[PDB]
């Protein structure tokens, strides 16, 4: 059901997605261990992910959440990094894309910082890095992230140093309370609360 439409670099939509990618890079407390050392990306391709069934599954759930939260879906665009991007774009998010050992429980995790999601492209903690070179800081191999539409509804705020949402909530927000430069991370517990809208293919760039 899924088709991928390549966006032109001249398209305003390509440019706005690239800017969110680039502008939300930060340094990480692991010195680059999980995701590599870089300050910016080389964006190689941005594709719009188009699947009618998956979209309608998303909007159906979005309406339910909205009606439970004074007509406010609390929809965000957030990054997701996974070695299972291909299953996600074809079959959608589900319990198999949950992070069982995550700090907010077994749910599906999303980041405001693209560089946070980049730490997960090759697995938890970056796995063993790229398939070809076993390098978590590989500057050659092509990486992919998803930029996703995510329904948060009423989000449980966790001040921060498949399962179920906290009762009376539709998601969890992990608010950073130590690292002043970190942006928030979010967890949903229903795969239908996210749609993988853009597939971004990129390399991390070696600092000059
Ligand atoms: C676990 C995980 C996977 N993919 C992500 O993009 C992500 C983003 C923020 C926090 C996480 N824990 C994750
Ligand atoms: Zn490599």
């Amino acid at each position: 059901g899924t088709i991928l439409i390549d966006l032109s670099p001249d398209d305003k939509e390509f440019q706005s997605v690239e800017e969110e990618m680039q502008s939300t890079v930060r340094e990480h407390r692991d010195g680059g261990h999980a995701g590599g050392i870089f300050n910016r990306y080389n964006i190689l391709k941005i594709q719009k992910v188009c699947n009618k069934k998956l979209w309608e599954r998303y909007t159906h759930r979005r309406k339910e959440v909205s009606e439970e939260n004074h007509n406010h879906a609390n929809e965000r665009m957030l990054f997701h990094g996974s070695p299972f991007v291909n299953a996600i774009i074809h079959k959608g998010f589900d319990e198999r894309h949950a992070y069982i050992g995550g700090m907010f429980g077994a749910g599906i995790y999303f980041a405001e910082n693209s560089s946070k999601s980049n730490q997960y492209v090759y697995g938890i903690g970056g796995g063993t890095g790229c398939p070809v070179h076993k390098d978590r800081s590989c500057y050659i191999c092509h990486r992919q992230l998803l930029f996703c539409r995510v329904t948060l509804g009423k989000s449980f705020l966790q001040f921060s140093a498949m399962a179920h949402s906290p009762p009376g909530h539709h998601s969890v927000t992990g608010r950073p309370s130590v690292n002043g430069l970190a942006l928030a991370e979010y967890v949903i517990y229903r795969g239908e609360q996210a749609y993988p809208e853009y597939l971004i293919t990129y390399q991390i760039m070696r600092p000059e």
Side-chain angles (χ1 to χ4, degrees):
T2 295
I3 81 176
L4 304 182
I5 306 288
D6 208 10
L7 301 182
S8 170
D10 293 337
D11 196 329
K12 67 176 171 182
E13 196 176 343
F14 182 109
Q15 291 158 18
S16 60
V17 172
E18 168 155 12
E19 184 54 19
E20 189 77 346
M21 264 288 283
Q22 300 285 12
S23 67
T24 63
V25 175
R26 62 171 179 88
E27 290 179 322
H28 293 264
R29 297 171 95 211
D30 70 0
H33 189 83
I37 301 171
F38 64 96
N39 295 315
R40 61 194 173 97
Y41 313 108
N42 182 32
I43 303 296
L44 293 161
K45 198 175 274 276
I46 302 181
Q47 288 158 304
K48 179 160 250 171
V49 179
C50 308
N51 184 308
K52 179 176 199 292
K53 193 183 76 204
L54 293 188
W55 178 252
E56 281 171 16
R57 172 187 305 178
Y58 175 73
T59 60
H60 185 262
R61 176 56 181 164
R62 177 174 69 185
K63 187 175 170 294
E64 292 182 337
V65 166
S66 179
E67 291 179 5
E68 285 170 8
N69 193 54
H70 44 268
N71 306 316
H72 181 42
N74 195 24
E75 174 176 278
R76 304 301 177 77
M77 295 293 304
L78 299 165
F79 294 101
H80 187 79
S82 181
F84 311 120
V85 164
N86 196 248
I88 294 163
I89 70 174
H90 287 103
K91 285 161 294 206
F93 287 100
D94 66 47
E95 48 285 338
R96 297 186 310 275
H97 307 108
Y99 179 19
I100 297 318
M103 277 209 291
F104 314 109
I108 310 173
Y109 284 63
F110 294 85
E112 286 179 0
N113 288 122
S114 62
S115 59
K116 174 51 72 174
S117 290
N118 173 70
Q119 298 184 308
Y120 287 91
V121 164
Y122 294 133
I124 298 300
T128 54
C130 67
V132 165
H133 301 95
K134 306 305 190 195
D135 187 356
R136 288 180 296 268
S137 198
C138 192
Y139 298 112
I140 306 177
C141 285
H142 291 192
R143 305 178 177 214
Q144 293 186 312
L145 273 183
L146 296 170
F147 189 44
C148 305
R149 195 170 294 272
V150 183
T151 287
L152 297 176
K154 187 169 158 53
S155 198
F156 186 96
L157 191 53
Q158 185 66 256
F159 286 69
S160 169
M162 195 135 51
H164 278 104
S165 264
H169 299 77
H170 302 102
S171 66
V172 169
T173 297
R175 191 180 162 297
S177 82
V178 168
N179 182 349
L181 300 185
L183 301 182
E185 306 166 21
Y186 303 87
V187 184
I188 61 177
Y189 301 87
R190 302 275 306 268
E192 308 96 337
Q193 269 172 242
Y195 182 82
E197 209 158 298
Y198 304 89
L199 179 61
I200 300 171
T201 306
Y202 67 98
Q203 298 157 312
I204 60 164
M205 292 185 69
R206 185 195 298 275
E208 286 223 74

